[PDB]
Enzyme design. Structure first.
Site, PDB file in Angstrom:
ATOM      1  N   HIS A   1       0.843  -1.224   0.000  1.00  0.00           N
ATOM      2  CA  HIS A   1       0.000   0.000   0.000  1.00  0.00           C
ATOM      3  C   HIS A   1       0.868   1.260   0.000  1.00  0.00           C
ATOM      4  O   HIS A   1       0.882   1.971   1.022  1.00  0.00           O
ATOM      5  CB  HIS A   1      -0.943  -0.016   1.198  1.00  0.00           C
ATOM      6  CG  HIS A   1      -1.989  -1.071   1.111  1.00  0.00           C
ATOM      7  ND1 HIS A   1      -1.859  -2.291   1.740  1.00  0.00           N
ATOM      8  CD2 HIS A   1      -3.178  -1.078   0.480  1.00  0.00           C
ATOM      9  CE1 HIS A   1      -2.931  -3.012   1.499  1.00  0.00           C
ATOM     10  NE2 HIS A   1      -3.755  -2.287   0.722  1.00  0.00           N
TER      11      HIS A   1
ATOM     12  N   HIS B   1       1.675   1.278  -5.887  1.00  0.00           N
ATOM     13  CA  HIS B   1       0.285   0.764  -5.950  1.00  0.00           C
ATOM     14  C   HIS B   1      -0.639   1.906  -6.400  1.00  0.00           C
ATOM     15  O   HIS B   1      -1.332   1.740  -7.413  1.00  0.00           O
ATOM     16  CB  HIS B   1      -0.105   0.138  -4.607  1.00  0.00           C
ATOM     17  CG  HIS B   1      -1.557  -0.183  -4.483  1.00  0.00           C
ATOM     18  ND1 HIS B   1      -2.161  -1.130  -5.275  1.00  0.00           N
ATOM     19  CD2 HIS B   1      -2.516   0.308  -3.664  1.00  0.00           C
ATOM     20  CE1 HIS B   1      -3.435  -1.212  -4.949  1.00  0.00           C
ATOM     21  NE2 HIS B   1      -3.683  -0.335  -3.965  1.00  0.00           N
TER      22      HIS B   1
ATOM     23  N   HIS C   1      -6.236   7.079  -2.746  1.00  0.00           N
ATOM     24  CA  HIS C   1      -7.145   6.024  -2.234  1.00  0.00           C
ATOM     25  C   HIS C   1      -6.506   5.227  -1.085  1.00  0.00           C
ATOM     26  O   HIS C   1      -7.284   4.611  -0.339  1.00  0.00           O
ATOM     27  CB  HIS C   1      -7.651   5.151  -3.390  1.00  0.00           C
ATOM     28  CG  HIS C   1      -6.796   3.977  -3.680  1.00  0.00           C
ATOM     29  ND1 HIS C   1      -5.694   4.064  -4.488  1.00  0.00           N
ATOM     30  CD2 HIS C   1      -6.887   2.697  -3.272  1.00  0.00           C
ATOM     31  CE1 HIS C   1      -5.124   2.881  -4.567  1.00  0.00           C
ATOM     32  NE2 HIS C   1      -5.838   2.023  -3.826  1.00  0.00           N
TER      33      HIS C   1
ATOM     34  N   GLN D   1      -4.360 -16.982  -3.371  1.00  0.00           N
ATOM     35  CA  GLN D   1      -4.472 -16.468  -4.754  1.00  0.00           C
ATOM     36  C   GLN D   1      -5.720 -17.027  -5.415  1.00  0.00           C
ATOM     37  O   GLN D   1      -6.469 -16.253  -5.983  1.00  0.00           O
ATOM     38  CB  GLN D   1      -3.243 -16.847  -5.564  1.00  0.00           C
ATOM     39  CG  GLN D   1      -2.053 -15.971  -5.240  1.00  0.00           C
ATOM     40  CD  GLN D   1      -2.074 -14.731  -6.095  1.00  0.00           C
ATOM     41  OE1 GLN D   1      -1.173 -14.502  -6.899  1.00  0.00           O
ATOM     42  NE2 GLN D   1      -3.093 -13.908  -5.906  1.00  0.00           N
TER      43      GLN D   1
HETATM   44  C1  LIG Z   1      -2.991  -5.153  -7.791  1.00  0.00           C
HETATM   45  O1  LIG Z   1      -2.679  -6.510  -8.030  1.00  0.00           O
HETATM   46  C2  LIG Z   1      -2.882  -7.507  -7.034  1.00  0.00           C
HETATM   47  C3  LIG Z   1      -3.500  -7.156  -5.834  1.00  0.00           C
HETATM   48  C4  LIG Z   1      -3.725  -8.114  -4.798  1.00  0.00           C
HETATM   49  C5  LIG Z   1      -3.340  -9.423  -4.973  1.00  0.00           C
HETATM   50  C6  LIG Z   1      -2.692  -9.808  -6.216  1.00  0.00           C
HETATM   51  C7  LIG Z   1      -2.469  -8.857  -7.220  1.00  0.00           C
HETATM   52  C8  LIG Z   1      -3.613 -10.337  -3.873  1.00  0.00           C
HETATM   53  O2  LIG Z   1      -3.237 -11.689  -3.997  1.00  0.00           O
HETATM   54  C9  LIG Z   1      -3.546 -12.538  -2.927  1.00  0.00           C
HETATM   55  C10 LIG Z   1      -4.252  -9.849  -2.695  1.00  0.00           C
HETATM   56  C11 LIG Z   1      -4.613  -8.493  -2.609  1.00  0.00           C
HETATM   57  C12 LIG Z   1      -5.306  -7.947  -1.350  1.00  0.00           C
HETATM   58  O3  LIG Z   1      -5.667  -8.743  -0.545  1.00  0.00           O
HETATM   59  N1  LIG Z   1      -5.523  -6.497  -1.202  1.00  0.00           N
HETATM   60  C13 LIG Z   1      -6.150  -5.901  -0.020  1.00  0.00           C
HETATM   61  C14 LIG Z   1      -6.955  -6.647   0.839  1.00  0.00           C
HETATM   62  C15 LIG Z   1      -7.500  -6.081   1.985  1.00  0.00           C
HETATM   63  C16 LIG Z   1      -8.424  -6.953   2.846  1.00  0.00           C
HETATM   64  O4  LIG Z   1      -9.507  -6.531   3.086  1.00  0.00           O
HETATM   65  N2  LIG Z   1      -8.077  -8.294   3.302  1.00  0.00           N
HETATM   66  C17 LIG Z   1      -6.776  -8.870   3.014  1.00  0.00           C
HETATM   67  C18 LIG Z   1      -9.063  -9.075   4.041  1.00  0.00           C
HETATM   68  C19 LIG Z   1     -10.037  -9.686   2.996  1.00  0.00           C
HETATM   69  C20 LIG Z   1      -9.573 -10.578   2.015  1.00  0.00           C
HETATM   70  C21 LIG Z   1     -10.448 -11.119   1.072  1.00  0.00           C
HETATM   71  C22 LIG Z   1     -11.798 -10.768   1.099  1.00  0.00           C
HETATM   72  C23 LIG Z   1     -12.275  -9.881   2.057  1.00  0.00           C
HETATM   73  C24 LIG Z   1     -11.397  -9.339   3.000  1.00  0.00           C
HETATM   74  C25 LIG Z   1      -7.272  -4.739   2.261  1.00  0.00           C
HETATM   75  C26 LIG Z   1      -6.464  -3.971   1.417  1.00  0.00           C
HETATM   76  B1  LIG Z   1      -6.224  -2.449   1.794  1.00  0.00           B
HETATM   77  O5  LIG Z   1      -5.486  -1.652   1.018  1.00  0.00           O
HETATM   78  O6  LIG Z   1      -6.766  -1.896   2.894  1.00  0.00           O
HETATM   79  C27 LIG Z   1      -5.905  -4.562   0.276  1.00  0.00           C
HETATM   80  N3  LIG Z   1      -4.340  -7.685  -3.628  1.00  0.00           N
HETATM   81 MG   LIG Z   2      -5.373  -0.102  -2.872  1.00  0.00          MG
HETATM   82 MG   LIG Z   3      -6.970   0.181   0.290  1.00  0.00          MG
END
Ligand SMILES: [C]OC1=[C]C2=C([C]=[C]1)C(O[C])=[C]C(C(=O)[N]C1=[C]C(C(=O)N([C])[C]C3=[C][C]=[C][C]=[C]3)=[C]C([B]([O])=O)=[C]1)=N2
Ligand SMILES: [Mg+2]
Ligand SMILES: [Mg+2]
Ligand SMILES: [C]OC1=[C]C2=C([C]=[C]1)C(O[C])=[C]C(C(=O)[N]C1=[C]C(C(=O)N([C])[C]C3=[C][C]=[C][C]=[C]3)=[C]C([B]([O])=O)=[C]1)=N2
Ligand SMILES: [Mg+2]
Ligand SMILES: [Mg+2]
Lengths: 355, 355
Positions: B72, B76, B138, B305
């Site tokens: 983050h 990104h 964001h 994944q």
């Molecule tokens: C841009 O390209 C990619 C981006 C990828 C990715 C692969 C490629 C990936 O592979 C596993 C995972 C994520 C990911 O998890 N991002 C993310 C998640 C959560 C969250 O809410 N999490 C982990 C609980 C959750 C997981 C699944 C469903 C609901 C909730 C918060 C934020 B953030 O920035 O606050 C960001 N992003």
């Molecule tokens: Mg983001």
């Molecule tokens: Mg975010």
């Protein structure tokens, strides 16, 4: 112990004459919310059920009280009035409501006359009704006597902080909880486990956030769909979301009770809110902002305000609650005291407007 | 530099990590430079008469608000900004044009013919700017923890925002707080009160849509309007229909990786797990249960994944693609990132089933 029975008797009246209690307390009127909170938890038995130690209970609510400012309307007294309303609405007998019964409360200060009467206390778990009551206490904590529109208009720090969404209502809940967590002599919920507490907190916040009137017609829609569909059965008491929604509407109604009370009380509350309105208009004028409707002291339109508010806000809410058969009343047809008050008041103001 | 970069970014699979490496010592300025480049390309500088000095002042500040954390970060932010721009400018098969109230066209491509349309033709310039600016903000001041972590630990932010969209509110709140915190930042000085108020609204709504707890809500609402067979789809004239399209657009941009070349997808994956493991490390130290997929000594990397592509990314891209809003080209239609998404989804399904 002598004082307890005096008060609990006075509060069993829907039109609880609170301004007399404020006057009777005189010097110690600042402690009104803490004393009433104690009284009502004793009456409902919430102290024994969640094994709440008095010292911390009183520590917290004494703090909470002081977070309410010295302003015409959004003060400890309002908080106390709303707390009373929710308690009365959730305890007193409701014609034709089913009983049902995880703990549940009963008001020591009345049993359901018979089996043709139900209480909300019988259908909503004690944990959930406590949230509602605690939410009532917090719901306007540290209110600065300005509207959301004002704070947004002026890019106030709070308004920026909360991205203009439910600014005051988020602040009420956030700074209330921040206080509760700000020292261990406040943790009166020490005997709830992680999950119970998490949930309690959730329920409190949802209750406080429902008091934003920008969400009024949204809440009202959602409620008529569930409760007042003619082809549906109304409220599944077993359902978590149906129970929360009932409480949300309950506090919403508690927060704006005045027109559904005796004229004496309705008018005292009116006096308060316009005085708060005019202070804001005074400031709007000084900053060269367009003066919000009904906030120009040099042009009250007091009849138009009262009628508009009863018609667009209070009226439809009470009718939804009443149609859903959740209002305390008695059999004859049904006599609902506050529907009588609401109608009498609605007529008085329609009259002052027309003529 | 300008023509070099804009050509590289016209590739959906813009090789950003090369640009970060190519900038070396000045890689901290990547977001500000790309922001400048894309506003020039879209002509947003001329349309809203944005003075470069303030523009660059602000976004240089914004950049620094992004922390030195695996995922983050400014990179990104830049990637997401790219995705939204590409998605909104490039040609879309079978989409009607409308206006090509201001609208943009990317200097760096024209619609091959009349069988192609752009989102840029159907969404007003004011609204697309919000989206781009929203992309930039964001994840501003992201502390490399999840909402669930902050809530679990009663972190001050979590209390402040009553556990609702904690990070996403803070991203928007502290970003705007920065923009308003000095006049050398007011690059929107030529929008009137109304235009600006609205712009701000649209930006916040865009940022708040990036909370994945609201994922299935947004997904539902979108298929109802866009992919209903008995409804007439997206009224481009309608404010709420246009907002919802942008919300889904950034939603998709925020999680683009699986819809890119494996090279890029895997680099992004590497980042997020490294951020996950740092959180697990802290959970472990505070004696908290380590969240799913956050114990470095137990990746379950294929399961993460596959789950994520199947349950989150897959359904989103299919909704967008069903609604005929994805840039692609005629043959049947070839949608580049649907191919990437499918090939990637297969490679991970494979590592799971087999290893
Ligand atoms: C841009 O390209 C990619 C981006 C990828 C990715 C692969 C490629 C990936 O592979 C596993 C995972 C994520 C990911 O998890 N991002 C993310 C998640 C959560 C969250 O809410 N999490 C982990 C609980 C959750 C997981 C699944 C469903 C609901 C909730 C918060 C934020 B953030 O920035 O606050 C960001 N992003
Ligand atoms: Mg983001
Ligand atoms: Mg975010
Ligand atoms: C309990 O007894 C009474 C309570 C009465 C009342 C009479 C009796 C009354 O007579 C006209 C008016 C109000 C009233 O306006 N309360 C109030 C208003 C707003 C607000 O949001 N305003 C003014 C903008 C607005 C108006 C309508 C729709 C949306 C917004 C916020 C809060 B609060 O407690 O935070 C409280 N309350
Ligand atoms: Mg309030
Ligand atoms: Mg109130």
């Amino acid at each position: 112990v002598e004082e307890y029975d005096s008060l609990i008797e006075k509060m069993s009246n829907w039109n609880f004459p609170i301004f007399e209690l404020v006057e009777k307390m005189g010097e110690d009127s600042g402690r009104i919310l803490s004393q009433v909170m104690y009284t009502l938890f004793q009456d409902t038995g919430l102290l024994e059920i969640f094994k709440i130690p008095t010292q911390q209970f009183m520590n917290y609510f004494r703090a909470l009280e002081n977070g309410y400012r010295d302003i015409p309307y959004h003060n400890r007294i309002h908080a106390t009035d709303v707390l009373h309303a929710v308690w009365y609405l959730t305890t007193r007998p409701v014609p034709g409501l089913q009983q049902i019964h995880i703990a549940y409360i009963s008001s020591k200060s009345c049993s359901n006359p018979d089996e043709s009467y139900g209480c909300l206390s019988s259908n909503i778990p004690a944990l959930e009704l406590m949230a509602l009551y605690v939410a009532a206490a917090m719901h306007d904590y540290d209110h600065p006597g300005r509207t959301n529109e004002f704070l947004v208009a002026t890019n106030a720090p709070q308004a920026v902080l909360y991205n203009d969404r439910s600014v005051l209502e988020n602040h009420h809940a956030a700074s209330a909880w921040n206080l509760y967590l700000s020292r261990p002599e406040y943790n009166f919920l020490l005997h709830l486990d992680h999950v119970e507490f998490e949930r309690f907190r959730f329920l409190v916040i949802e209750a406080i956030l429902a008091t934003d009137l920008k969400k009024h017609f949204d809440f009202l829609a959602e409620f008529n769909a569930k409760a007042n569909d003619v082809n549906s059965n109304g409220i599944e008491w077993s359902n978590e979301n149906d129970r929360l929604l009932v409480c949300q509407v309950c506090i919403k109604l508690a927060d704006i009770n005045g027109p559904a009370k005796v004229r004496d009380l309705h008018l005292k509350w009116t006096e308060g809110i316009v005085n708060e309105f005019y202070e804001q208009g005074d400031e709007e004028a000084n900053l060269g902002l367009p003066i919000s409707p009904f906030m120009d002291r040099s042009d009250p339109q007091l009849a138009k305000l009262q009628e508009s508010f009863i018609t667009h806000i209070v009226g439809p809410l009470c009718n939804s609650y009443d149609a859903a058969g959740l209002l305390p009343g008695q059999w004859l047809r049904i006599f609902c005291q506050l529907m009588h008050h609401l109608t009498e008041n609605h007529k008085i103001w329609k009259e002052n407007l027309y003529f």
